[PDB]
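Title: [Solved] endothiapepsin 3D structure

Original question kept below for reference.
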Amino acid sequence: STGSATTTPIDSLDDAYITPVQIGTPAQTLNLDFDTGSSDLWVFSSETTASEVDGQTIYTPSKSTTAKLLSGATWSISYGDGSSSSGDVYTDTVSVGGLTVTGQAVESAKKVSSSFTEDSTIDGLLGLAFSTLNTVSPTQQKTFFDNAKASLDSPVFTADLGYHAPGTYNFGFIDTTAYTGSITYTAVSTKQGFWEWTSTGYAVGSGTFKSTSIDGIADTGTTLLYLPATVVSAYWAQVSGAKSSSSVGGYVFPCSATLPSFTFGVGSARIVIPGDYIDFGPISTGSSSCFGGIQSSAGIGINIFGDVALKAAFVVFNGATTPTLGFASK
Ligand SMILES: CCCC[C@H](NC(=O)[C@H](Cc1ccccc1)NC(=O)N1CCOCC1)C(=O)N[C@@H](CC1CCCCC1)C(O)(O)C(F)(F)C(=O)NC
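Solution (posted by the thread starter after getting help):
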């Protein structure tokens, strides 16, 4: 079996991608952020504290015939940006893109932080990292993908993010029309439960490639590219008024710059992020100072290939028994 769903940026900087998902019987449609660095499917719900919901679409398990409370399960997550949510758990049927999974744990928020409340177009998350990270206690629950994987023609999904434009997640199959040339696949480490891989090095603009291993995670739920403070200095040194800013917390640059591209290595292959994908945009409505898309990881403590990097590529998460990550140009 297969499924094919359209994800669409939430805003005109592609800060994040929402993808329609059907939960329950009959279907409730919520739009979920597809998250490869987390392993919880959680949703806005009927049980969500009322003062914390603001225009989001809520799951009402009371209305679904397939919904069962999972008695005493609780869950509680917190993420890189300090956002958090917790609450209780049903199981229910979930479809993505035609692909149906029965008995999926759907974690129902009771309490979300302010950051969630603020973001009206995201009605919760669909984790796609490794099931080890799921936070439901006391019985850890499986991911959407792990539940599908039985049924799948092929235990891969693929991510094909767009630059200011809709893009597609596919389960079960590789669209050989979606990419040019060949996919290079590269080993994953599951140890910390991330799709963990190692980049082969980098180029700035039309500079020389440096060979150098950068360990990072492929993370569709993280907006920017976060690189070691060395790699990142190299890049912004090539941008005329660019500097590191304490008030902004970041690398800023005059909006009037052109950015050079960034190449990252995948085995012997090279992926090139066009300069314009790096252009985040104005830091504050009407400032002549723009925020960059390439940011240092020193403070976070892993390297993240976020959406800037992965929208440059057609990406396969091959969830075989030995997982791999495949990258191709498109
Ligand atoms: C500092 C490094 C991590 C930050 C990363 N978040 C991000 O990258 C959020 C994504 C977002 C877009 C729109 C609205 C709200 C959030 N964006 C963000 O912080 N910025 C600030 C810089 O401008 C660009 C957008 C993150 O926490 N990713 C989570 C999942 C998200 C959490 C917040 C809601 C959206 C999804 C993650 O699961 O992928 C994780 F790996 F980082 C994680 O915490 N695993 C436990």
